[PDB]
Write a protein that binds this ligand. Sequence first.
Ligand code: 5AU
Ligand code: 5AU
Ligand code: CA
Ligand code: CA
Lengths: 210, 209
Amino acid sequence: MPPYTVVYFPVRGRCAALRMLLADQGQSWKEEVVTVETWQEGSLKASCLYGQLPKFQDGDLTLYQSNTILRHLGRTLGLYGKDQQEAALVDMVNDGVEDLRCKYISLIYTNYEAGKDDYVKALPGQLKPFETLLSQNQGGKTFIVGDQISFADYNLLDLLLIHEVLAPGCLDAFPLLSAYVGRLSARPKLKAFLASPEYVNLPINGNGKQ
Amino acid sequence: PPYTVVYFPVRGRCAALRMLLADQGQSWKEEVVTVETWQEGSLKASCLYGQLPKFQDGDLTLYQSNTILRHLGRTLGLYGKDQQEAALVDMVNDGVEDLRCKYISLIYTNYEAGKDDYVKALPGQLKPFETLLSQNQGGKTFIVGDQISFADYNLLDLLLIHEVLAPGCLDAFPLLSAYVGRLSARPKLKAFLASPEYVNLPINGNGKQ
Ligand SMILES: N[C@@H](CCC(=O)N[C@@H](CS[As](SC[C@H](NC(=O)CC[C@H](N)C(=O)O)C(=O)NCC(=O)O)c1ccccc1)C(=O)NCC(=O)O)C(=O)O
Ligand SMILES: N[C@@H](CCC(=O)N[C@@H](CS[As](SC[C@H](NC(=O)CC[C@H](N)C(=O)O)C(=O)NCC(=O)O)c1ccccc1)C(=O)NCC(=O)O)C(=O)O
Ligand SMILES: [Ca+2]
Ligand SMILES: [Ca+2]
């Protein structure tokens, strides 16, 4: 059997980036799907460390927390910078991505109708830092940190993709981010994954909003 | 090194990294930024995400409180003994961060109407850290493994600010209670926690705690 298992709801959500990472690195994994019905039964939830999914298994190592999973795969597959300084910058990018992801999640699940206009107005100022990081790394022609891909690239890519669904054209203001999405999305194993039913037939979020 | 911490005159998201630096015998410079200096706009515009803390380690400039914690963890060997422990350290820290975000939302956004619900939910929010202790050498050492990690300083801070918010919140948790006592008694950390530089700073920026 595969050494990796992803336990999650039938949504892209906080597993999208880590799935992209695994597919792009040609790793095999099992998807264990938890229905809302099963979740409401309560036993699985009670057994989860923080009462939430995703849960991830790497052999007998059981992890919770989407960013913990990303960092763990980053470490074990060599997607965490070439040295200690690049590692810090990778973290800095990922923490920025997480901060914006949390704002996105708050919009989607708690305030979509009343909040979308303001959110979209504020969006360029929230995306700009990633454009700046790109502009300061080899003119934005490679990755978000250094000259090799990192877990932060996959997470940032996911963040950009869902924001283009939320606010079509939002990357027209950001030439380097725009080209970056194109480039990464064209990586053959990733392109194939992103076009596959496994990805395409899951909704982005759990409540029908995007 | 040497290190510079750039932040507002509060404990906030720098408290844990300060505890770490002091406990580890490191020296650093505090650059205090006043609310007045921030409102001018220039420093803020130079910050990657328009926010503090900002941190300098020689020629390296970092933003993001957990990035700074992880960098110190990595460079000072406070990140577990191997990749497996490193993942566990991250898992703890990410749990600490989630609860810290809820705390921050309460304090700054909804203190008066939200505190009652927050406090009632608190035991179930703290229990995971007691369980983690229970599963690691009977709770007698650190949150992960046999050596201190950056996640211990972050968890310690989280627990200390929660005992201010809800006195007695650790009483039902013997391992966490004992852990806070043990860590707080480490000599350099004890000295730091007793010092004016810690005690005379407010926890948060808005008078609430
Ligand atoms: N008391 C809960 C409130 C309920 C809640 O979970 N709200 C969500 C948006 S619902 As979605 S993602 C599934 C969710 N897992 C996480 O939030 C993990 C966060 C962690 N930091 C990480 O990065 O891994 C979950 O497990 N919910 C179940 C539960 O808590 O009972 C969804 C909905 C329906 C079907 C499929 C998927 C929220 O706002 N989360 C915050 C965030 O994701 O940043 C509480 O305390 O949050
Ligand atoms: N819409 C704004 C809201 C403004 C805001 O910052 N709210 C705070 C609570 S105020 As405090 S802590 C200083 C703060 N830095 C961060 O939030 C960094 C987050 C990062 N993930 C990390 O971990 O480092 C900041 O720089 N604020 C200034 C600014 O943004 O211009 C304080 C107040 C007064 C005096 C001293 C200290 C908030 O809710 N932050 C989120 C969090 O900490 O999780 C927005 O976009 O945030
Ligand atoms: Ca000074
Ligand atoms: Ca050590």
